[PDB]
Amino acid sequence: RGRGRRRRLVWTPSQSEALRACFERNPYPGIATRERLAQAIGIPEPRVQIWFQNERSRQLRQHRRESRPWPGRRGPPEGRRKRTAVTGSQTALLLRAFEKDRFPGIAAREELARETGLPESRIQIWFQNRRARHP
DNA sequence: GCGTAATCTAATCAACA
DNA sequence: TGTTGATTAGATTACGC
């Protein structure tokens, strides 16, 4: 990988309380739920998404260690993020960047956002998918 | 150093031209 | 329908405290 990752966030206690309470309600929130929590506690939705991935990993691993069944999905699955439209010039920017560095740090990713107008979070997924499809 | 946010791979679901 | 964006499980990495 590269270097220069995002500076880790530190949850305030109230933020932790809010994430844990949301998680009780449903450990598989949709984009509508994630954006709703994001705005309630004043952090960007992408940080919320990463915290649910990590909190599920922790719950699964504890359930596993306690030899307990994971409830899993409950209720109707909530809607996904709408698919991001990526123009041909946006794709071109990204492709050039990818040729020089497959593993951009937060620095590189945030300027691509400036340049392409795409969200940094979507750029990060773009590279994940590109790497996994173009060794 | 600990705890865990941030990052990663791989497999898969699914939108859209 | 094929391309590719979005999500998941789970492993790993590297920071703030």
Swiss-Prot record:
UniProt-reported outcome of changing residue 129 to E: Decreased DNA binding affinity
Annotated protein name in UniProt: Double homeobox protein 4
Impact upon substituting residue 80 to A: No effect on DNA binding affinity
Effect of residue 128 to E: Decreased DNA binding affinity
UniProt tissue specificity: Isoform 1: Does not seem to be expressed in normal muscle, but is detected in muscle of individuals with FSHD, and also in testis (at protein level). Isoform 1: Does not seem to be expressed in normal muscle, but in muscle of individuals with FSHD, where it may be toxic to cells. Isoform 2: Detected in skeletal muscle, fibroblasts and testis from healthy individuals.
Organism field: Homo sapiens (Human)
Gene Ontology CC terms, in alphabetical order: cytoplasm; cytosol; Golgi apparatus; nuclear membrane; nucleolus; nucleoplasm; nucleus
Disease / disorder: Facioscapulohumeral muscular dystrophy 1: A degenerative muscle disease characterized by slowly progressive weakness of the muscles of the face, upper-arm, and shoulder girdle. The onset of symptoms usually occurs in the first or second decade of life. Affected individuals usually present with impairment of upper extremity elevation. This tends to be followed by facial weakness, primarily involving the orbicularis oris and orbicularis oculi muscles.
Effect of substituting residue 82 to A: Decreased DNA binding affinity
GO biological process, one term: apoptotic process
Residues of the whole record sequence present: 16 to 150 of 424
Quaternary assembly: Binds DNA as a monomer. Interacts (via C-terminus) with EP300 and CREBBP.
Superkingdom of the source species: Eukaryota
TM region(s), chain numbering: none
Region of interest (Disordered), ranges: 57-87
Impact when changing residue 11 to A: No effect on DNA binding affinity
